[PDB]
Design a protein around this ligand. Structure first.
Ligand SMILES: CCCCCCCC/C=C\CCCCCCCC(=O)O
Ligand SMILES: CCCCCCCCO[C@@H]1O[C@H](CO)[C@@H](O)[C@H](O)[C@H]1O
Length: 292
């Protein structure tokens, strides 16, 4: 369990499920946002290598796992950013500025959140964030455009419904992926099948005109030290995105990881956790120097 405890917090009829350890102290608290179709426990690999003197919060994103799934919820990046601000206000996480960490769709929400509520965030860590406008499409984005041409919504690579589709999703999302036995693939996809209608609705909403490039559209408003962590072998969100952010945001440190695909937090958890803590210390040192 790593000392992480699951709790639920309510905003009227909406509930957020989150895991946590430690308590608000002198250092900035850390709020972690997972990616598309995942949940708060994808952060456990990194938490295992994080120090115990930090206040860590890992929240299930809107409609995922223990957080409310409602047909009336606004699943656009703007609406998810707003839900995250309600959750933050619920826990009083912004009592003093906090460090905000996000991966992929969570990375996009994190970037847009720092642009919407700049006084809430002390520093940002964006792990292969979605929401950028690339000059050319990688094979995955060319596949999505091809699927749009036949409206084959049942073939979205990140929404598998069969063992063979699950094996393709596992290959696309990680650099090293040896073949898994059919029984294990079947078990992995069965836990996701009841949630595929929601993932299909969420996916179409985050790739819609209003959300597809919202991080790129808001990155001029990010005013805090930002760390970018990206895997050079990312087959989902191309690693060229790291330079687009770095050249558009001041005080930006880029960490390109070798032998690493889209699932950074699962593939390189030790290096990722080390980079997270090192960046936190360098931000504190520059803040102590800048005084007066
Ligand atoms: C149906 C329209 C097709 C056009 C696509 C336009 C560009 C957007 C394409 C891909 C972005 C995918 C972002 C999904 C979240 C990343 C996965 C994750 O969170 O791990
Ligand atoms: C990933 C593509 C799978 C097949 C999608 C079938 C067509 C869905 O429809 C399209 O979805 C887009 C994305 O939300 C919208 O931008 C378009 O307006 C809409 O017509």
């Amino acid at each position: 369990t790593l000392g992480m405890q699951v709790r639920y917090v309510h905003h009227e009829d909406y509930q957020f499920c989150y895991s946590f350890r430690g308590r608000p102290g002198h250092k900035p608290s850390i709020l972690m946002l997972h990616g598309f179709s995942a949940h708060k426990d994808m952060w456990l690999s990194v938490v295992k290598f994080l120090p115990k003197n930090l206040h860590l919060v890992c929240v299930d994103m809107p409609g995922h796992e223990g957080t409310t799934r409602s047909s009336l919820d606004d699943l656009s990046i703007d609406g998810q950013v707003k839900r995250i601000h309600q959750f933050v206000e619920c826990l009083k996480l912004n009592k003093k500025p906090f460090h905000l960490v996000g991966t992929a769709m969570g990375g996009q929400v994190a970037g847009v959140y720092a642009a919407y509520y700049p006084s809430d965030v002390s520093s940002l860590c964006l792990v292969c964030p979605a929401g950028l406008q690339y000059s050319t499409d990688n094979q995955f984005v060319q596949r999505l455009k091809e699927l749009q041409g036949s409206a084959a919504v049942e073939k979205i690579p990140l929404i598998p419904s069969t063992p063979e589709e699950m094996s393709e999703m596992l290959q696309l999302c990680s650099y090293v992926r040896f073949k898994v036995p059919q029984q294990i693939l079947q078990g992995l996809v069965d836990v996701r099948i009841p949630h595929n209608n929601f993932y299909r609705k969420l996916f179409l909403e985050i790739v819609s005109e209003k959300s597809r490039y919202s991080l790129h559209q808001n990155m001029d408003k990010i005013k805090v030290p930002t760390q970018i962590i990206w895997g050079k072998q990312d087959q989902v969100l191309d690693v060229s995105g790291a330079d687009m952010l770095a050249k558009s945001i001041a005080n930006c440190q880029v960490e390109l990881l070798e032998n690493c695909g889209h699932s950074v937090v699962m593939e390189r958890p030790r290096k990722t956790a080390k980079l997270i803590i090192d960046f936190l210390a360098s931000v504190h040192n520059t803040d102590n120097n800048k005084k007066l």
